Every structure is written in structure tokens, then in C-alpha cells.
Amino acid sequence: SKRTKKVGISGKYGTRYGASLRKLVKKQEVTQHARYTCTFCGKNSVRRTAVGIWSCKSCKKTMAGGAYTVSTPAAAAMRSTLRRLREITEA
Amino acid sequence: AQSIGAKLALVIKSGKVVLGYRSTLKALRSGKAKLILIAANTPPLRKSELEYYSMMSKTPVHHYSGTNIELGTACGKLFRCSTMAILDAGDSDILAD
Amino acid sequence: GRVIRNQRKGRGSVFTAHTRLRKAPAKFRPLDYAERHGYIRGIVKEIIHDPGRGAPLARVVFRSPYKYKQITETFIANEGMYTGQFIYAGKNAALTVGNILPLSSVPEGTVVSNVEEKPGDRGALGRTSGNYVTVVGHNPDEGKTRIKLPSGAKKVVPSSSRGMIGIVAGGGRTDKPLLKASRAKHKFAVKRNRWPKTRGVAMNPVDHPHGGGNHQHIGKASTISRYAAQGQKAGLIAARRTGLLRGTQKTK
Amino acid sequence: REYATISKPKKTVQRAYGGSRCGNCVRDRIIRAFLIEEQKIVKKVLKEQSQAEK
Amino acid sequence: RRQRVLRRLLVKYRASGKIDKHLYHELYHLAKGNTFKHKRALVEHIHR
Amino acid sequence: KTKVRKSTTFHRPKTLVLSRAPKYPRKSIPHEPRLDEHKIIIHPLNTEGALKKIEEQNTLVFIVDVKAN
RNA sequence: GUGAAGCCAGAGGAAACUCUGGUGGAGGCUCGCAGCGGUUCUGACGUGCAAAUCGAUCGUCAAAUCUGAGCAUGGGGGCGAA
RNA sequence: ACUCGUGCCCCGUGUGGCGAAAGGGAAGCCGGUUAAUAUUCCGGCACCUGGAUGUGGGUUUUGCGCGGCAACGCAACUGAA
RNA sequence: UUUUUACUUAUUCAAUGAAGCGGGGCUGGACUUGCGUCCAACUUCUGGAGUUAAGG
Ligand SMILES: [Mg+2]
Ligand SMILES: [Mg+2]
Ligand SMILES: [Mg+2]
Ligand SMILES: [Mg+2]
Ligand SMILES: [Mg+2]
Ligand SMILES: [Mg+2]
Ligand SMILES: [Mg+2]
Ligand SMILES: [Mg+2]
Ligand SMILES: [Mg+2]
Ligand SMILES: [Mg+2]
Ligand SMILES: [Mg+2]
Ligand SMILES: [Mg+2]
Ligand SMILES: [Mg+2]
Ligand SMILES: [Mg+2]
Ligand SMILES: [Mg+2]
Ligand SMILES: [Mg+2]
Ligand SMILES: [Mg+2]
Ligand SMILES: [Mg+2]
Ligand SMILES: [Mg+2]
Ligand SMILES: [Mg+2]
């Protein structure tokens, strides 16, 4: 079944706070409650514990991530840039 | 290399392999392992242990660039595989290089 | 008239920051011989949530160069850091995320966190979630380094100042609406007694410069001079301009 | 406070790091220590043979 | 109560050998769905 | 010419201390032991419940000084 | 009482995602008892039981809910969802 | 370390108090008993902490237990900084 | 006379358990031809261990 047309996870808020605010909250809530594959062990068991803290239930590893996503695009771009600018210094 | 996937598919189709850490260690101990594959995201301690076992067995090691998910998919399974051993390479030439 | 709320806040009392659930301040290691000449290796034991702080903290254990003990430090966690990770702090440390390096040994264009204003101060700049300091340039003869701050300002710090390679974890925390008075209350209940806030125009003349009147109105220009007396500084202090910002701003 | 009145064998298990470690961690420690010392020995011998050969 | 009854019956049948593991698994998923309204319905489905 | 200091911290050196040897006692006569037995025990209690336990339990009830243990 | 995500099964279709039974147990959601409060009777009383109470009727009732003890802020000062 | 207190030798980064009869925290149960107290008295049956030295047991005599593949077990089964 | 920039000891700030600051000289090197100068001091595969010094 579907149980809902568009409100999705944001249906717990009823008719309150306004549609635009409900959509904005839903956008972050979906990613913040989603499950993620562990980079270290490969299991789909990484979940958010605190605002910027993501832990794997299987391999028990904890990593520092984004507020509502495990990795932010800024950090990914910074990692790529760091690798490039470090390799051009090393060799 | 990219050809490792085709070689692995041929080896599984024709020869025989063991998938998993315990079976790989058993093969290395018994000396019937011809080559071992270790996934990139294998834990460092386990990877070093497997490398030491293969040094003892004089068995070649290939460091598969993919994760355990990708290694299992290459082996044609629906589960992950952190490490595996090839006990018999058949029509494939995986042991040539 | 009365002493206004902004004046009362500086007395302390009920406006003191809450500290029970805060375990330790987030600081670098003290600048020592190992960090000055080579590098030292530390192990990340845990990534913890610090109440009142958006960014997570990292507990990192080091060995004492001079004693058999071991020392646990509390760093601001950079995003990508994980438990069981080796981090390296020193002049000769590798240029990887989480390593603490002096700005002299860092190329131009890299971002760092918890940058020291002066070497040995254990971190002052760019220590909030999603924030960082960019290494704009170097002046080796002067022994200094130009950096760009989160606010957009340009600063010059001695090249011996240290920073942690990467971006502070905690991502886009302010990307989701608080959506609820309770959530604002929970946010501030571990920081300070500053919420909720009553508007000055809703007060009486005894309580605030914006005072009373038969309509809720300020009644005089809300921009207040930089050298106004204490008790007068309510509104927009030393405002260069007012109104909606309708374009790019020359200042940065 | 109750641990002060029961005997040591009931308070510990008979192996290295009997209490405070779970055994799997002890095995991991043993294997890791052996591998790091082996790697250190071969690294020092390689550095001596390939950087001090002249 | 219904789910416990159905799973108990499925375990009993698998242990006795009336059903193999594949039929047991598909029947378990059908019973997690709303397919069988009572033990009698499950038994009739199993026999068919 | 200077002694080796293996610690970067300076500690006050330990010096000789002497016990007091006064040339006059501050008090001449030490006080007699206060709260002797004659002050500790005042008188027995002879109420109904006090006399009951003399037979039922082989105990004597006394009124004693308040600061006696 | 309602029944948000997540999950199971079955129907369509070509796709992609549509639909239908269930499961589940979210929400500064809701009816309502105690507690907390105090809308109306502009009721009782109004030299009172009471220097603010009594009755009926009402608001809220799982969280900006109610509350004890310890502690802090002291008079042009404090504290103030004002 | 001496007949005798006072002769030395090591470690050191720290170096106060008050503040909870609802927080933390060593250990007591049942039956009976008075006009009035009782988890406090009486009877029975226990526990904890501290200090002392015994009997048995265990271990060893160039030394500090044994068993189980293992998870661990067994009445102990040396251990300063 | 006025301005600018030099010194450090007055004064001010910061860190630390007030450990390695400043000059050298022994070695290791890599760069250069009236054999002359610059750099450096041994830790980066692994969530192990590192103390109460071995030796001459
Ligand atoms: Mg005033
Ligand atoms: Mg307001
Ligand atoms: Mg008003
Ligand atoms: Mg005024
Ligand atoms: Mg004014
Ligand atoms: Mg208005
Ligand atoms: Mg006007
Ligand atoms: Mg409600
Ligand atoms: Mg009431
Ligand atoms: Mg009235
Ligand atoms: Mg009347
Ligand atoms: Mg009333
Ligand atoms: Mg009526
Ligand atoms: Mg006290
Ligand atoms: Mg208590
Ligand atoms: Mg007793
Ligand atoms: Mg008794
Ligand atoms: Mg005892
Ligand atoms: Mg004996
Ligand atoms: Mg040489």
C-alpha cells in the first residue's frame, strides 16, 4: 500500500507548521533516518546516533559525518582535492 | 586488472574455489591453495594474517581492488566475500600472471 | 528606569553557560618538541557528542614522550574521522584528513580546522560544524601565512600556527527548520538562558529603550551609535546600512 | 564492593588479560603484535640491505 | 496469536518432514502476509 | 659546579624539625580524669518496666551521665 | 480514538510505478480520569468555612506537563513567554 | 637500618574544608514480647568491616597448581613500583 | 625640531609538569669545479606492546 500521497515521513506533523516547512524537514529526515552501507565492513548497517555521528551496528565503528547525511559533498570534494594536491607535492 | 573478473568467472565456471576467511585459511594450511584474493576493504589485521599465511604456503596473493561486495559479485554470489582461494584453475589462465 | 535584560546578562547568575554535561574543552595538544620537530601518532578512541556543540568531538590517545603514561586529548572531529584511526600531529605529519600540521608545511588552497591564532594557543579559528579556514598563501621570508576565515575575512597568522586537515564534522546542521518552540528550547537549554526572547517594543518604558507607547513602535531610529552608553545599546549597533540586502556587498 | 570477598578464580579467567579482555580481543592482540614485530624486522633488514649497501 | 499459531505449525511440519525448507520459507512469508486466516486454512493450503 | 636536576620542578628541601621542649609547662597541674565511675553511674531506675526486665532478661537499668559512652 | 515512516503478501502493467489486504505504533495529534489551571453562572458567600473560599460548568492532560529538597540572583537591585 | 625516638635511601605534575536523613554507599531475617519501643528488646538463625595469630588443606624445595581443542573450569594456586 | 624603523631590559600577552631554545661540532646526505657550499638527525601498512636501562 501507500497510505499517503506526498507527505511521506512528514505525516507525523499533521496540518501544522506549513507545507513548505514540512517538505524542508522531510528532506533532511529521510536521509537522517536512512540506513547506509559501512565503508569498512560493507554491511548496510550504518546509522546516525548524534547530529554528526554515524556508527555501524555490525563492525562497531564510529565515524564523523554530516548532520543528516553520512558524507557531505563539500567533504567529498575536499577529499578529492586533498588527494590531488598532495600527490602533486609528493610526486 | 580489468580481466580479473573474466578470469574469476571462468575459474568458478570450470575449476573450483573456496569463499571465506575460514575456508581460505584451511586451504592455505593444507597447501592446496594456488592463489588467494583479498578484497580492498578487508580489515588490516586479517589481511596481514592472510599475507603471512600465504608467505608460509608460498601462495600468491592478489589484492582485489573492489570491496567484499564487489568481490562476491565478481564470484557470482549474492553475498559478500572478504577473501577467497582458488583450489583449481581450470580452462582459465588465472595462475599464468 | 530599570537595568535592561542585555545589561543584566553580564552579571552572570542565571545567564551563566551550562557546563555539567560538557566533559572537556576541545583543544589541541600543547605545542611540544615532537610536534615542533617531527610528528607524533595518536589513536582515535571515540567520537562523542558534546551537549551545546553542533560539531562532534574526537577523543584521541597519545603516548607521553617523557613518561610511561598515556594522554587522552579532546579534538574537534573533522568529517571523515573514525574510531580506530591513526592521526599524526607535527611538522612532518602527512597531509591527510585529521592530521594536525603547522600552516608552514601545508600547501596553498587546503582547508583546515581549529586553526591557532598564535602557535601554542591550541586552536581558535574555524571550529564549528561545516566550517573551515582556507590557506590562501605563504610568506616564508616574513614567516607568516594568509588565511581566509569562515566569515570571509582575510587574516595573517604566523606560519607556526597549527590546524587539522579537513572540514569540521556536523555538516549542514542549520539546513533543517527547527519547526517547533520545543526544539528551539531544547537547543538552548544546554547552552544558555536566552530563550524565549521578549521584544523590546512589547515592554514598558521602564524596561527598555523601545519602551511603550500607545502603539508598539520604536519611535526613534533603531541604529545606535558605536559610542552610546551602556543601557542605550539596543537595536542595530553601529550599523553602516540597513534594509534588505539587494545585491553583492563590497565589504567582505 | 562485593568483589572484595570472593576468591580470585571466580573474579578472573585463566589466560592472559583474563579479566577486562574478552579472549577474542586477546587473540587479536597476539596476532597483531606478532605481525607488527615481523613487519618491523623485515623493514629494518630491507632498509639496511637496500639503503646501506654502499 | 494467529502468527504464533501459524509459525508453530510450520515449524512442526518442517521438523516432521511434511514440508521441506523451500516450501516452509514461502509458507512463512505467506503467513507473514495475510494469506491464511486460521490454522485450518493453512493446513488445507499445505495439503493442496 | 651545579648539581644535576632531572626534574624541571623545584621542591622545597626537607629540613630538620624539632619537637617542643618548653622551659615551663603552660598548665601546672594536669586535670584529674573527668567522668570517673562515680559521675558515670548516677542511680538505678526502679520503674515498673525497669524492674520487669531484671527478672525477664537479666539486665539492670541505670541512669548514667549523658556524655558517657 | 486516529493511524506517520519502515516491513509482509497479493493484484495490474512493459516500462516506472500504480492499486489492494495486512503489519507497525509516529505525533509540542485527539476524547477523557487523577494532577495542574481557572472560562461562565457576572451562582453561593460577601461582619464568609475563607483578608480570594465553595458548587456546577469549563481549559489542558505524555510534554513549552506537574512537583519536592539543595543551591544562585537582593531594592533604583533582582527576576520577568512582558 | 639500631639496646635505645632521632642514620639514611627512593618517588612527586596536586596542593584545603563545608555542601544530599530523596543522588553514590559494607553488612539482618523470622517468630515472640510492652500500657506505651522495636529490622533496635528476647529466642533462633545469619551477615559485613577491621585486627590478630592458629589448625587443616594447597603449592614449592634451582621454585610460585592442574584440567579443557576452545568458550572456560576447579577450594586455594606469590607477587612491589 | 618632526617622521620612519631598529634594540630589549621597563611594560603587556600566551603555553607548559617552565624538555629539549640559541651557538657550535660529529655523522648522514645532495648540489656545485681556484673543494666550495646548503640540508638533516633515523617513529606512516595494521585499534598490540613500550616504564623500574641493556651493554662498552
Ligand atoms: Mg536603573
Ligand atoms: Mg520575541
Ligand atoms: Mg504592555
Ligand atoms: Mg527609557
Ligand atoms: Mg533613545
Ligand atoms: Mg505591531
Ligand atoms: Mg509617528
Ligand atoms: Mg496535546
Ligand atoms: Mg484544580
Ligand atoms: Mg458572583
Ligand atoms: Mg448574605
Ligand atoms: Mg471555583
Ligand atoms: Mg444544576
Ligand atoms: Mg561532607
Ligand atoms: Mg541515600
Ligand atoms: Mg542482634
Ligand atoms: Mg536476639
Ligand atoms: Mg574477617
Ligand atoms: Mg601445608
Ligand atoms: Mg657516508
mmCIF file of N, CA, C and O (backbone and C1' of nucleotides) in Angstrom, chain H residues 21-46:
data_model
loop_
_atom_site.group_PDB
_atom_site.id
_atom_site.type_symbol
_atom_site.label_atom_id
_atom_site.label_comp_id
_atom_site.label_asym_id
_atom_site.label_seq_id
_atom_site.Cartn_x
_atom_site.Cartn_y
_atom_site.Cartn_z
ATOM 1 P P A H 21 19.181 15.061 53.182
ATOM 2 O "O5'" A H 21 19.671 13.976 54.243
ATOM 3 C "C5'" A H 21 19.935 12.631 53.859
ATOM 4 C "C4'" A H 21 19.030 11.646 54.562
ATOM 5 C "C3'" A H 21 17.529 11.860 54.353
ATOM 6 O "O3'" A H 21 16.873 10.592 54.321
ATOM 7 C "C1'" A H 21 18.004 11.875 56.648
ATOM 8 P P A H 22 17.019 9.599 53.068
ATOM 9 O "O5'" A H 22 17.448 10.529 51.850
ATOM 10 C "C5'" A H 22 16.465 11.167 51.046
ATOM 11 C "C4'" A H 22 16.238 10.446 49.739
ATOM 12 C "C3'" A H 22 17.183 10.830 48.611
ATOM 13 O "O3'" A H 22 17.229 9.752 47.678
ATOM 14 C "C1'" A H 22 15.001 11.519 48.060
ATOM 15 P P G H 23 18.499 8.775 47.594
ATOM 16 O "O5'" G H 23 19.393 9.421 46.450
ATOM 17 C "C5'" G H 23 18.940 9.490 45.106
ATOM 18 C "C4'" G H 23 20.080 9.832 44.185
ATOM 19 C "C3'" G H 23 21.320 8.970 44.366
ATOM 20 O "O3'" G H 23 21.259 7.768 43.622
ATOM 21 C "C1'" G H 23 21.941 11.234 44.476
ATOM 22 P P G H 24 21.509 6.356 44.341
ATOM 23 O "O5'" G H 24 23.088 6.273 44.482
ATOM 24 C "C5'" G H 24 23.921 6.219 43.336
ATOM 25 C "C4'" G H 24 25.372 6.257 43.728
ATOM 26 C "C3'" G H 24 25.795 5.225 44.759
ATOM 27 O "O3'" G H 24 26.098 3.970 44.178
ATOM 28 C "C1'" G H 24 26.610 7.353 45.384
ATOM 29 P P G H 25 25.755 2.611 44.956
ATOM 30 O "O5'" G H 25 26.505 2.757 46.350
ATOM 31 C "C5'" G H 25 27.924 2.739 46.435
ATOM 32 C "C4'" G H 25 28.388 2.902 47.859
ATOM 33 C "C3'" G H 25 28.016 1.748 48.785
ATOM 34 O "O3'" G H 25 29.027 1.575 49.774
ATOM 35 C "C1'" G H 25 27.017 3.743 49.568
ATOM 36 P P A H 26 30.274 0.597 49.510
ATOM 37 O "O5'" A H 26 29.681 -0.870 49.687
ATOM 38 C "C5'" A H 26 28.682 -1.152 50.654
ATOM 39 C "C4'" A H 26 29.017 -2.370 51.475
ATOM 40 C "C3'" A H 26 27.874 -2.909 52.319
ATOM 41 O "O3'" A H 26 27.105 -3.840 51.582
ATOM 42 C "C1'" A H 26 29.831 -2.682 53.653
ATOM 43 P P A H 27 25.511 -3.890 51.713
ATOM 44 O "O5'" A H 27 25.268 -4.943 52.877
ATOM 45 C "C5'" A H 27 25.995 -6.162 52.920
ATOM 46 C "C4'" A H 27 26.076 -6.685 54.328
ATOM 47 C "C3'" A H 27 24.785 -6.589 55.119
ATOM 48 O "O3'" A H 27 23.934 -7.692 54.869
ATOM 49 C "C1'" A H 27 26.589 -5.759 56.416
ATOM 50 P P G H 28 22.434 -7.459 54.360
ATOM 51 O "O5'" G H 28 21.678 -6.971 55.669
ATOM 52 C "C5'" G H 28 21.795 -7.702 56.883
ATOM 53 C "C4'" G H 28 20.470 -8.270 57.306
ATOM 54 C "C3'" G H 28 19.412 -7.233 57.689
ATOM 55 O "O3'" G H 28 18.122 -7.737 57.351
ATOM 56 C "C1'" G H 28 19.754 -8.687 59.479
ATOM 57 P P C H 29 17.517 -7.589 55.872
ATOM 58 O "O5'" C H 29 16.421 -8.740 55.821
ATOM 59 C "C5'" C H 29 15.513 -8.920 56.898
ATOM 60 C "C4'" C H 29 15.200 -10.374 57.134
ATOM 61 C "C3'" C H 29 14.030 -10.654 58.059
ATOM 62 O "O3'" C H 29 12.775 -10.533 57.420
ATOM 63 C "C1'" C H 29 15.845 -12.016 58.677
ATOM 64 P P C H 30 11.484 -10.133 58.277
ATOM 65 O "O5'" C H 30 11.085 -11.480 59.025
ATOM 66 C "C5'" C H 30 10.681 -12.627 58.294
ATOM 67 C "C4'" C H 30 10.613 -13.851 59.173
ATOM 68 C "C3'" C H 30 9.738 -13.738 60.409
ATOM 69 O "O3'" C H 30 8.362 -13.925 60.136
ATOM 70 C "C1'" C H 30 11.815 -14.672 61.011
ATOM 71 P P G H 31 7.261 -13.116 60.979
ATOM 72 O "O5'" G H 31 7.206 -13.879 62.375
ATOM 73 C "C5'" G H 31 6.804 -15.238 62.457
ATOM 74 C "C4'" G H 31 7.100 -15.822 63.816
ATOM 75 C "C3'" G H 31 6.590 -15.031 65.009
ATOM 76 O "O3'" G H 31 5.221 -15.266 65.284
ATOM 77 C "C1'" G H 31 8.836 -15.630 65.378
ATOM 78 P P G H 32 4.328 -14.128 65.976
ATOM 79 O "O5'" G H 32 4.926 -14.005 67.445
ATOM 80 C "C5'" G H 32 4.793 -15.063 68.379
ATOM 81 C "C4'" G H 32 5.584 -14.790 69.632
ATOM 82 C "C3'" G H 32 5.198 -13.539 70.401
ATOM 83 O "O3'" G H 32 4.077 -13.737 71.240
ATOM 84 C "C1'" G H 32 7.542 -13.624 70.166
ATOM 85 P P U H 33 3.124 -12.501 71.610
ATOM 86 O "O5'" U H 33 4.015 -11.595 72.567
ATOM 87 C "C5'" U H 33 4.493 -12.086 73.809
ATOM 88 C "C4'" U H 33 5.541 -11.174 74.392
ATOM 89 C "C3'" U H 33 5.084 -9.763 74.713
ATOM 90 O "O3'" U H 33 4.425 -9.688 75.961
ATOM 91 C "C1'" U H 33 7.162 -9.697 73.576
ATOM 92 P P U H 34 3.032 -8.910 76.091
ATOM 93 O "O5'" U H 34 3.461 -7.420 76.442
ATOM 94 C "C5'" U H 34 4.269 -7.147 77.574
ATOM 95 C "C4'" U H 34 4.550 -5.675 77.706
ATOM 96 C "C3'" U H 34 3.337 -4.762 77.684
ATOM 97 O "O3'" U H 34 2.673 -4.698 78.936
ATOM 98 C "C1'" U H 34 5.014 -3.895 76.257
ATOM 99 P P A H 35 1.069 -4.671 79.006
ATOM 100 O "O5'" A H 35 0.673 -3.409 78.121
ATOM 101 C "C5'" A H 35 -0.672 -2.965 78.007
ATOM 102 C "C4'" A H 35 -0.710 -1.489 77.705
ATOM 103 C "C3'" A H 35 0.414 -1.003 76.804
ATOM 104 O "O3'" A H 35 0.024 -1.047 75.444
ATOM 105 C "C1'" A H 35 0.297 0.349 78.760
ATOM 106 P P A H 36 1.029 -1.570 74.316
ATOM 107 O "O5'" A H 36 1.939 -0.302 74.005
ATOM 108 C "C5'" A H 36 1.364 0.880 73.472
ATOM 109 C "C4'" A H 36 2.183 2.099 73.804
ATOM 110 C "C3'" A H 36 3.654 2.044 73.426
ATOM 111 O "O3'" A H 36 3.869 2.339 72.059
ATOM 112 C "C1'" A H 36 3.404 2.934 75.612
ATOM 113 P P U H 37 4.814 1.407 71.157
ATOM 114 O "O5'" U H 37 6.286 1.697 71.694
ATOM 115 C "C5'" U H 37 6.982 2.889 71.355
ATOM 116 C "C4'" U H 37 8.429 2.599 71.047
ATOM 117 C "C3'" U H 37 8.661 1.741 69.815
ATOM 118 O "O3'" U H 37 8.726 2.502 68.624
ATOM 119 C "C1'" U H 37 9.808 0.789 71.650
ATOM 120 P P A H 38 8.162 1.899 67.251
ATOM 121 O "O5'" A H 38 9.403 1.099 66.655
ATOM 122 C "C5'" A H 38 9.319 -0.287 66.363
ATOM 123 C "C4'" A H 38 10.567 -1.012 66.799
ATOM 124 C "C3'" A H 38 10.854 -2.340 66.114
ATOM 125 O "O3'" A H 38 11.575 -2.157 64.908
ATOM 126 C "C1'" A H 38 11.327 -2.426 68.470
ATOM 127 P P U H 39 10.827 -2.044 63.495
ATOM 128 O "O5'" U H 39 11.588 -3.109 62.590
ATOM 129 C "C5'" U H 39 11.512 -4.497 62.888
ATOM 130 C "C4'" U H 39 12.850 -5.185 62.768
ATOM 131 C "C3'" U H 39 14.033 -4.474 63.427
ATOM 132 O "O3'" U H 39 14.905 -5.449 63.993
ATOM 133 C "C1'" U H 39 14.502 -4.848 61.147
ATOM 134 P P U H 40 14.843 -5.773 65.560
ATOM 135 O "O5'" U H 40 15.738 -4.637 66.221
ATOM 136 C "C5'" U H 40 17.157 -4.681 66.133
ATOM 137 C "C4'" U H 40 17.808 -3.824 67.188
ATOM 138 C "C3'" U H 40 17.282 -4.030 68.607
ATOM 139 O "O3'" U H 40 18.347 -3.894 69.543
ATOM 140 C "C1'" U H 40 16.973 -1.775 67.965
ATOM 141 P P C H 41 18.757 -5.131 70.478
ATOM 142 O "O5'" C H 41 17.554 -5.256 71.512
ATOM 143 C "C5'" C H 41 17.652 -4.737 72.830
ATOM 144 C "C4'" C H 41 16.556 -5.289 73.703
ATOM 145 C "C3'" C H 41 16.454 -6.807 73.732
ATOM 146 O "O3'" C H 41 17.312 -7.376 74.703
ATOM 147 C "C1'" C H 41 14.317 -5.871 73.317
ATOM 148 P P C H 42 18.283 -8.594 74.325
ATOM 149 O "O5'" C H 42 17.349 -9.877 74.433
ATOM 150 C "C5'" C H 42 16.737 -10.233 75.661
ATOM 151 C "C4'" C H 42 15.678 -11.284 75.454
ATOM 152 C "C3'" C H 42 16.095 -12.479 74.615
ATOM 153 O "O3'" C H 42 16.809 -13.446 75.360
ATOM 154 C "C1'" C H 42 14.010 -11.677 73.856
ATOM 155 P P G H 43 18.051 -14.218 74.702
ATOM 156 O "O5'" G H 43 17.367 -15.282 73.736
ATOM 157 C "C5'" G H 43 16.547 -16.314 74.260
ATOM 158 C "C4'" G H 43 15.897 -17.119 73.164
ATOM 159 C "C3'" G H 43 16.800 -17.544 72.020
ATOM 160 O "O3'" G H 43 17.584 -18.682 72.329
ATOM 161 C "C1'" G H 43 14.792 -16.673 71.149
ATOM 162 P P G H 44 19.016 -18.887 71.635
ATOM 163 O "O5'" G H 44 18.667 -19.314 70.143
ATOM 164 C "C5'" G H 44 17.877 -20.463 69.879
ATOM 165 C "C4'" G H 44 17.357 -20.467 68.463
ATOM 166 C "C3'" G H 44 18.402 -20.362 67.368
ATOM 167 O "O3'" G H 44 19.038 -21.596 67.097
ATOM 168 C "C1'" G H 44 16.620 -18.887 66.901
ATOM 169 P P C H 45 20.591 -21.633 66.704
ATOM 170 O "O5'" C H 45 20.624 -21.048 65.226
ATOM 171 C "C5'" C H 45 19.884 -21.668 64.188
ATOM 172 C "C4'" C H 45 19.673 -20.744 63.018
ATOM 173 C "C3'" C H 45 20.913 -20.101 62.431
ATOM 174 O "O3'" C H 45 21.700 -20.965 61.636
ATOM 175 C "C1'" C H 45 19.243 -18.470 62.655
ATOM 176 P P A H 46 23.231 -20.580 61.356
ATOM 177 O "O5'" A H 46 23.130 -19.389 60.307
ATOM 178 C "C5'" A H 46 24.101 -18.356 60.256
ATOM 179 C "C4'" A H 46 23.622 -17.211 59.401
ATOM 180 C "C3'" A H 46 24.685 -16.247 58.911
ATOM 181 O "O3'" A H 46 25.395 -16.738 57.790
ATOM 182 C "C1'" A H 46 22.852 -15.025 59.748
#
